[PDB]
């Protein structure tokens, strides 16, 4: 965390760039404030490939059917196609997850955000 | 508790969001399932719109450099009343407006301004201060595309629409990175590709990124060599005898472009002196179908391959797609082609492939130009917020247009200025030199966005003969580098309207109140008006001719015309407030919208009735009889095409689109022996431009805290560098210290490096070269030579 990447000290002067912050791999889910607030990724992404031929994510994040019971790993809302219809499995829109789900690092916000929570309009804390 | 409709404040895609409101607070941001663009889906930045207006910095009071003691450029920054702020800001104006006059006052707007904010601005700058020195940040963005639009079609914006995503048979991405910059569109493209396995995607790029991860034909070419590839395909269409004759013969003309055009710099710089023919540039000169074909002949598959660096087999793959007269090609391009010193040519060349084959104006067959900002289309382009422009594709040059504007704006004849204003780049230069002495920046952070800041933008803002105002919602380096900073009501704190890349014009009411004393840019503009008088600013002759325009005050003349006052403080939806209507007695937006609307309506550009846009989630325009237009220039789809016609690019008189014969040329600056690396510059999913908004949303900041240099894993080992090393990206113009990141999302080719510009600590634009496409004047941020230590 350096010269307010927001304000820039006496501009163009010459600034030292802090070292890359490290990703948070501690597998703890974080907790959101409103439905539809994309969960943050609590684990690593690194080697995971998302391409025309493979989607590493869908390997762990899926729902079991054929009569069996396992713990759900994606919400069924990820099954609806444009038009809201519910397909029998994750729909291709939604295939590239990296577009909505972001992992996180140890980085101190350069400024506090006074966004408030729906219940108890108290500044959000996750 | 209370959900309101609203368009995403970022992307040119234009997703619909449903803002959740409680106790005067936005407490949630969901996807609008009733919106055609996205249909309930947003991307990271979208869902986090809820946290954008809430950083603890939000400017709340105007800040002048010295409250009392007077005001000194090299001062402090002090709180100051609005009145005070305007008092000082008006005085500075009046002066400049008498020592050097209009060609010395200048505005720099944005494709992030609301439709009526860019309209109120155009009006104020021209009908008011009588200066066409108004240019937008869109100059760095869509100029190239817009410029080629007029040249090839005689009318701006695409002829297709997002509906093509579902109809296409195969997609070609010319250097785009939709995966990260137009996610929901990339989602829409991905759904088509993955859902119908016959579909084929080809992505071309300077480096490997998240987008060429869905590609079937993955091509990585040499910076700037896309020009050659484009011609090869034309040649291939022609050589294999697969031109659509009935179409080319009936709907096409040809032409040749001026060839030794010269990297839009200052006369003095070598490249321009050498540029025999930089005086024209954009010279057309008709031709022959035969001559074009022969020009394109030089670019053999064997040659194109040599210049790009792509195995010929891939170029054969591309060529063919653009050719089997059944593959509905759907070419998409963003800043790759636009921020190109030969961008206008590139745009031209893509259309050629489509014109030659007749693949245009049909569902699925379309050359779609993706637009970047939320309303670079809706506002900058359509309202015409560029130095040389007026509403609905009209130019300041043309007298008939000038007159037409004058008739609608209720002005005295010959009032509007005929001179072309200073474009973005020029504006910085004229600032450096001392030609523009009063400057008003709005809804942009140009001190970070603009090219070569150290050479010509920074000194220009700090030039003591200059006074600089910056309206913004957060700190920002540009503001830090200004003299007067005015606080703005942002996004949903003000009622507004935007226009997305597919001609979709959508509105939003004011859902919450801005913090402290901040007010919409609309207000700022309109209020600052109340200071000048028809005497003061207009030429005496014009006055003599019309007494009622003596005293008055730019406001009675600009916003109290009895045209813009037309509608009462009522007429504003019982629910929903409007600070710009509580102050003032009319309803600005409705007035401005409906006035501005009269420029189009009839001559293409048909906007729907103001009120309609509030009840619906946008309508793509020419909205004729309340019916939107998906595909333009097609009988049946477009109503401006007369029954017995078929197609008719009615922007052109003869109704034929131009095919330009143009030659590949090289970039302004290529790597040397001293500076061996290519400096590519761009963006990242998590951040929007300057990061003034996203770097404040915690999850986005945390997700990618600061800028980084993407490099090849081996180009690092060699220099004895590892991942995380603090490097110096160096140019003949500047240096940065970013940290190296190899093994990141962007997998660089040897000799190419990429750094995103969202970090103000890391101003890459100090490193960047000032070069533009000499026709559109759009600076090129995608390539220059850089060294790393
Ligand atoms: N190196 C490099 N530079 C580039 C480019 C590139 O590819 N590489 N891209 C270019 C392109 S395509 C573009 S579009 C430009 C974008 O460049 P800018 O227009 O400078 O980009 P933003 O940072 O979004 O600036 C928006 C400003 O709006 C402020 N803001 C937010 N809401 C409001 C409001 O309601 N009112 C006011 N007055 N301010 C508000 C924010 O704090 C911010 O300062 O950058 C260009 N510069
Ligand atoms: N997350 C996020 N998304 C955004 C924005 C944002 O601030 N944040 N900005 C929006 C705006 S205003 C805009 S203008 C768009 C920009 O969208 P893009 O143009 O997709 O954005 P960039 O990331 O700048 O990507 C630079 C691109 O340059 C290509 N390129 C480099 N050199 C050349 C060349 O010589 N020829 C060609 N053909 N391509 C070349 C590279 O392959 C790369 O894909 O993004 C929009 N999307
Ligand atoms: C936007 C178009 C998305 C894409 C692509 C993906 N996800 Fe998602 N996801 C999205 C939202 C808006 C939400 C809701 C957040 C809320 O607070 O209500 C989610 C949620 C998830 C979850 C959490 C499920 C739960 O029941 O709590 C998971 C595990 C998840 N998403 C997984 C996931 C995967 C694997 C994806 C790629 C195939 C993916 N999502 C894409 C939005 C979007
Ligand atoms: C197997 C290891 C994987 C793979 C390949 C991916 N994820 Fe993850 N993920 C995994 C676990 C065990 C958990 C915790 C599960 C639980 O408590 O039930 C997660 C969690 C997430 C979350 C947060 C979910 C929440 O808060 O409810 C997200 C957003 C997430 N995973 C995303 C994600 C993406 C995008 C992936 C592909 C790059 C991906 N995961 C792969 C285990 C695994
Ligand atoms: S794709 Fe663009 S408009 Fe849609 S939510 Fe993401 S940023 Fe916003
Ligand atoms: Mo842009």
Give me the CATH number covering residue B331.
3.40.228.10
CA distance B264 to B246: 39
Whole-number Cα distances in Å, B693 to B24, B109, B112: 20, 18, 13
List Cβ neighbours of B334 (8 Å cut-off, separation of 6 or more).
Answer: B175, B176, B177, B178, B181, B182, B370, B372
Distance from C-alpha of B172 to C-alpha of B356, rounded to nearest angstrom: 16
Say which CATH number the domain at B714 has: 2.40.40.20
Cβ of B685 closer than 6 Å to ligand 2, yes or no, is yes
Is B178 marked within a binding site? Answer: yes
Residues 6+ apart with CB under 8 A from B104: B96, B97, B435, B436, B437, B438
The C-alpha atoms of residue B375 and residue B690 are separated, in whole angstroms, by 17
The closest ligand to the CA of B186 turns out to be 5
Catalytic, B373? Answer: yes
The residue in chain A having the minimum alpha-carbon distance to the alpha carbon of residue B34 is A83
Resolution in A: 3.2
- Which residues on neighbouring strands pair with residue B678, listed in sequence order? B752, B785
* Token pair for B239: 């050589």
Query: What is residue B290's three-state secondary structure?
Result: helix
Exposure of A85 by Cβ count < 10 A (0-12 exposed, 13-18 middle, 19+ buried)? exposed
Looking from the CA of A27 toward its CB, the CA atoms found within 13 Å total 0
Alpha helices in B387-485 (DSSP H): 399-408, 424-433, 446-449, 458-462, 477-480
Partners of B170 in beta bridges:
B200, B329
Residue of A nearest to B685 (CA): A99
Question: What is the C-alpha to C-alpha distance for residues B4 and B17, in angstroms, rounded to an integer?
Answer: 8
The alpha-carbon gap from B701 to the nearest alpha carbon of chain A, in Å, equals 7
Catalytic residue among B12, B16, B45, B328: B45
Check CB contact under 8 Å for B739 and A19: yes
Q: Are B433 and B412 contained in the same domain? A: yes
Atom of ligand 4 nearest to the CA of A50: 38
8 Å CB contact between B535 and B556: no
Query: Quick one: CA torsion of A61, A62, A67, A69, rounded to 10 degrees?
Result: 20
* Known active-site residue B142: yes
Nearest-angstrom CA–CA distance, B64 and B418: 34
How far is the CA of B615 from the CAs of B4, B372, B505, B618, in angstroms?
Answer: 11, 26, 12, 9
- A-facing residues of B in 35-54 (CB < 8 A) are 39-44, 47-48, 50-51, 54
Instruction: Spot the catalytic one: B89, B141, B377, B447.
Output: B141
The four Cα atoms A32, A37, A43, A45 give a dihedral, to 10 degrees, of: -170
Cross-chain residue pair B691–A5, CB shorter than 8 Å: yes
Q: Please check whether residues B537 and B500 belong to one and the same domain.
A: no
| Dist CA B669 CA B271 (whole Å) | 10
Eight-class DSSP state of B104: G
Q: Are B658 and B152 in contact (CB under 8 A)?
A: yes
| Same domain membership, residue B675 and residue B662 | no
Which residues on adjacent β-strands are paired with residue B28? B20
Q: Which tokens sit at B702?
A: 């945390």
- Chain A residues within an 8 Å CB radius of B57: 6, 111
Range of the domain at A100: 1-126
| Residue at token pair 């009675």 | B556
Cα–Cα distances (Å) from A61 to A64, A100, B288, in that order, read: 10, 15, 59
What residues form DSSP beta bridges with B471?
A: B442, B486
Cβ–Cβ contact A84 with B under 8 A? yes
Claim to verify: residue B507 and residue B419 sit in the same structural domain: no
Residue B518, C-beta contacts closer than 8 angstroms, at least 6 positions apart: B58, B59, B60, B473, B487, B488, B489, B490, B493
Q: CA-CA distance, A118 to B3, in Å (whole number)?
A: 12
One domain for residues B265 and B300? yes
Q: For chain B, how many structural domains are there in total?
A: 4
Q: Is the CB of B15 under 6 A from ligand 5?
A: yes
User: Whole-angstrom Cα distance, residue B124 to residue B9?
Assistant: 25
Q: Omega into B181 within 30° of 0, i.e. cis?
A: no
Cα distances (Å, whole numbers) of residue B636 to B244, B367, B418? 21, 20, 39
Cβ of B696 and A101 within 8 Å? Answer: no
Q: Which residue has a Cα nearest atom 11 of ligand 2? A: B372
Asked if B189 and B252 sit in the same domain, the reply is: yes
Residues of A whose CB is below 8 A from B761:
2-5, 8, 15, 17
Residues B49 and B69 in one domain: no
**Residue B83, marked binder:** no
Pocket test for ligand 1, best of B57, B140, B375 (most atoms within 8 A of CB): B140
Q: Which of A12, A51, A80 sits opposite B454 (nearest CB)?
A: A12
Buried b (16+ CB within 10 A) or exposed e, B255-282: bbbbeebbbbbeeebebbeebeebeebe
Instruction: Give the domain-ending residue among B604, B629, B654.
Output: B629
> Is B208 labelled a binding residue?
yes
Q: How many CB pairs under 8 A join A and B?
A: 218
Chain A 31-60, CB below 8 Å of chain B: which residues? Answer: 33-38, 40, 49-52
Tell me how crowded residue B771 is: count the other CB atoms within 10 A of its CB.
27
Residues 195-224 of B with CB under 8 A from A: 195, 201, 210, 213-216
Q: Are strands B726-730 and B785-788 parallel, antiparallel or unpaired?
A: antiparallel
Cβ proximity of B8 and B44 under 8 Å: no
Q: At what angle do helices B301-308 and B312-321 cross, to 10 degrees?
A: 120
Q: For chain B, after which residues does the C atom lie more than 2.5 Å from the next written residue's N, i.e. where is it broken?
A: none
Tokens of B639: 């109503």
Q: What backbone torsions phi and psi does residue B39 show, to the nearest 5 degrees?
A: 65, 65
Interface with chain A: mutation pick from B56, B516, B693, B760, highest number of A CBs within 10 Å: B760
Tokens 């955000």 belong to A113
User: Could you say which of B109, B118, B372, B734 is catalytic?
Assistant: B372
Q: Residue B44: which CATH number?
A: 3.30.200.210
Choose among B143, B122, B110, B132: nearest CA to B775: B143
Neighbours of B407 (CB within 10 A): 11
> DSSP letter at B176?
-
Please state, in angstroms and rounded to a whole number, the distance separating the CA atoms of residues B82 and B521: 13
Site residues for ligand 3, CB cut-off 6 Å: A 32, 35-39, 57-58, 61, 73-75, 78, 90, 94-95, 97, 99-101; B 41, 47
Task: Report which of B590, B119, B600 is spatially closest to residue B385, judged by C-alpha positions.
Answer: B119
Residue B31 is among the residues annotated as catalytic for this protein: no
Q: Are residues B359 and B380 in the same domain?
A: no
Structural domain including B306 reads 137-374+630-666
Q: What is the best residue among B7, B9, B11 to mutate for testing ligand 5's pocket, by most ligand atoms within 8 Å of CB? A: B11
Q: Is B372 designated active site?
A: yes
Same domain, B456 and B565: yes
Identify the three-state secondary structure at position B108: strand
Could you tell me the two tokens for B205? 């790029």
Using the mean position of ligand 5's atoms as its centre, give its distance from the Cα of residue B124 in Å: 31
B377 ligand 2 Cβ < 6 A = no
Task: Specify whether the backbone of B584 is left (phi greater than 0), alpha (psi in -120 to 50) or beta.
Answer: left
φ/ψ of B217, rounded to 5, equals: -125, 85
**Cα–Cα–Cα angle for B655, B656, B661, rounded to 5 degrees:** 155
Closest Cα partner for A64 from A101, A37, A89, A98?
A89
Residue B334 beta carbon below 6 angstroms from any ligand 2 atom: yes
B372 CB less than 6 Å from ligand 5?
no
CB contact under 8 A, B195 and A92: yes
- Are A115 and B51 an interchain contact pair (Cβ–Cβ within 8 Å)? yes
Judge whether B330 counts as a catalytic residue. no
Distinct helix (H) and strand (E) counts, chain B: 29, 28
Q: Show the tokens assigned to A88.
A: 């029998």
Distant-in-sequence, close-in-space partners of B546: CB < 8 Å, separation ≥ 6 = B412
Token pair belonging to B273: 């002196």
Instruction: Identify whether residues B759 and B694 lie together within a single domain.
Output: yes
Task: Respond yes or no: is residue B447 known to be catalytic.
Answer: no
Nearest ligand 1 atom, CA B479: 44
Q: Are residues B142 and B44 in the same domain?
A: no
Q: Note whether B768 contacts A: Cβ–Cβ < 8 A.
A: no
Kindly state whether residues B600 and B702 are assigned to the same domain: no
Contact B187 A1 (CB under 8 A): no
Give chain A's domain count: 1
- In Å, the largest CA–CA distance within chain A is 65
Return the best residue to mutate from B120, B449, B769 for the ligand 1 pocket (most ligand atoms within 8 A of CB): B449
């Amino acid at each position: 965390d350096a010269p307010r990447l927001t304000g820039a000290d006496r501009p163009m002067s010459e600034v030292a760039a802090p070292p890359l912050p490290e990703t948070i791999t501690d597998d703890r889910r974080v907790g959101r404030n409103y439905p539809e607030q994309p969960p943050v990724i609590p684990h690593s992404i690194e080697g995971y490939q998302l391409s025309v031929n493979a989607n590493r994510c869908l390997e762990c994040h899926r729902r079991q059917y054929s009569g069996l019971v396992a713990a759900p790993m994606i919400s069924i809302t990820h099954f609806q196609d444009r038009e809201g219809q519910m397909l029998a499995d994750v729909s291709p829109r939604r295939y590239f997850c990296t577009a909505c789900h972001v992992p996180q690092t140890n980085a101190q916000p350069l400024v506090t955000n006074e966004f408030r929570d729906m219940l108890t309009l108290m500044p959000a804390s996750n | 508790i209370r959900w309101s409709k609203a368009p995403c404040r970022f992307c040119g895609t234009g997703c619909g969001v449903m803002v959740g409101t409680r106790d005067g607070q936005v407490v949630a941001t969901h996807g609008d399932t009733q919106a055609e663009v996205n249909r309930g889906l947003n991307c990271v930045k979208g869902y986090f719109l809820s946290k954008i207006m809430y950083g603890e910095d939000r400017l709340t009071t105007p800040l002048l450099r010295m409250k009392d003691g007077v005001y000194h450029k090299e001062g402090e920054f002090a709180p100051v009343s609005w009145d005070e702020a305007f008092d000082v800001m008006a005085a500075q104006a009046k002066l400049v407006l008498k020592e050097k006059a209009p060609e010395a006052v200048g505005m720099f707007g944005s494709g992030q301004w609301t439709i009526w904010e860019g309209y109120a601005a155009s009006k104020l700058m021209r009908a008011g201060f009588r200066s066409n020195n108004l240019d937008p940040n869109a100059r760095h963005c869509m100029a190239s595309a817009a410029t080629a639009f007029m040249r090839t079609f005689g009318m701006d914006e695409p002829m297709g629409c997002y509906d093509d995503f579902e109809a296409a048979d195969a997609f070609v991405l010319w250097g785009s990175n939709m995966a990260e910059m137009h996610p929901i569109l990339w989602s829409r493209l991905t759904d088509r590709r993955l859902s119908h396995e016959h579909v084929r995607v080809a992505v071309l790029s300077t480096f490997t990124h998240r987008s060429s991860d869905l590609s079937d034909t993955p091509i990585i070419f040499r910076p700037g060599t896309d020009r050659a590839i484009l011609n090869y395909i034309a040649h291939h269409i022609i050589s294999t005898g697969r031109v659509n004759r009935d179409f080319v013969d009936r709907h096409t003309n040809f032409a040749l472009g001026a060839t030794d055009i010269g990297y839009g710099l200052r006369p003095e710089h070598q490249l321009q002196l050498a540029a025999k023919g930089a005086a024209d540039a954009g010279a057309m000169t008709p031709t022959d179908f035969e001559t074009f074909a022969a020009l394109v002949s030089e670019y053999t598959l064997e040659k194109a391959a040599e210049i790009s660096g792509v195995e010929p087999a891939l170029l054969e793959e591309l060529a063919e797609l653009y050719a089997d007269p059944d593959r509905k090609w759907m070419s998409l391009w963003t800043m790759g082609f636009n921020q190109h010193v030969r961008g206008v040519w590139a745009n031209h060349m893509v259309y050629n492939l489509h014109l030659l084959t007749g693949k245009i104006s049909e569902p699925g067959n379309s050359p779609f130009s993706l637009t970047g900002q939320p309303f670079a289309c809706g506002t900058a382009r359509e309202v015409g917020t560029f130095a040389h422009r007026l509403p609905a594709d009209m130019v300041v040059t043309n007298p008939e247009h000038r007159a037409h504007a004058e008739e609608i704006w209720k002005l005295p004849a010959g009032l509007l200025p005929d001179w072309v204003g200073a474009h973005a780049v020029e504006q910085d230069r004229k600032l450096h030199d001392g030609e523009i002495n009063f400057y008003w920046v709005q809804v942009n952070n140009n001190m970070q966005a603009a090219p070569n800041i150290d050479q010509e933008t920074y000194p220009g803002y700090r030039n003591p003969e200059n006074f600089i105002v910056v309206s913004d919602a957060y700190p920002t380096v540009t503001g830090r580098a200004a003299d007067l900073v005015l606080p703005a009501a942002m996004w949903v704190e003000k009622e507004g309207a935007y226009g997305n890349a597919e001609r979709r014009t959508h509105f939003w009411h004011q859902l919450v109140e801005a913090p402290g004393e901040a007010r919409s840019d609309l207000w700022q503009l309109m209020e600052f008006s109340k200071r000048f008088t028809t005497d003061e600013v207009w030429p005496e002759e014009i006055l003599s001719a019309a007494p009622a325009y003596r005293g008055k005050t730019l406001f009675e003349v600009l916003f109290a015309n009895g045209s813009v006052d037309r509608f009462p403080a009522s007429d504003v939806n019982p629910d929903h407030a409007n600070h710009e209507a509580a102050l003032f007695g009319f309803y600005p937006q409705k007035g401005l919208f409906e006035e501005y609307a009269a420029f189009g309506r009839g001559h293409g550009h048909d906007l729907a009735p103001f009120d309609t846009y509030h009840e619906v989630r946008g309508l793509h325009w020419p909205v004729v009889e309340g019916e939107e237009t998906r595909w333009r220039y097609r009988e049946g789809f477009d109503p401006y095409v007369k029954p017995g016609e078929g197609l008719r690019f009615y922007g052109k008189p003869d109704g034929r689109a131009v095919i330009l014969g143009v030659p590949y040329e090289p970039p302004a600056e290529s790597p040397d022996e001293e500076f061996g690396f290519w400096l590519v510059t761009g963006r990242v999913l998590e951040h929007w431009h300057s990061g003034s908004m996203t770097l404040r949303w915690p999850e986005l900041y945390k997700a990618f805290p600061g800028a980084v240099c993407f490099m090849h894993p081996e180009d690092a080992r060699s220099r004895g560098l590892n991942r995380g090393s603090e490097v110096r990206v160096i140019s003949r113009r500047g240096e940065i210290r970013t940290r190296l990141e190899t093994r990141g999302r962007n997998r660089m080719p040897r000799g190419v490096v990429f750094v995103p510009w969202f970090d103000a600590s890391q101003l890459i634009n100090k490193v960047t070269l000032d070069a533009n496409d000499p026709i559109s004047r759009q600076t090129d941020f995608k390539k220059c030579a850089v060294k790393i230590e």
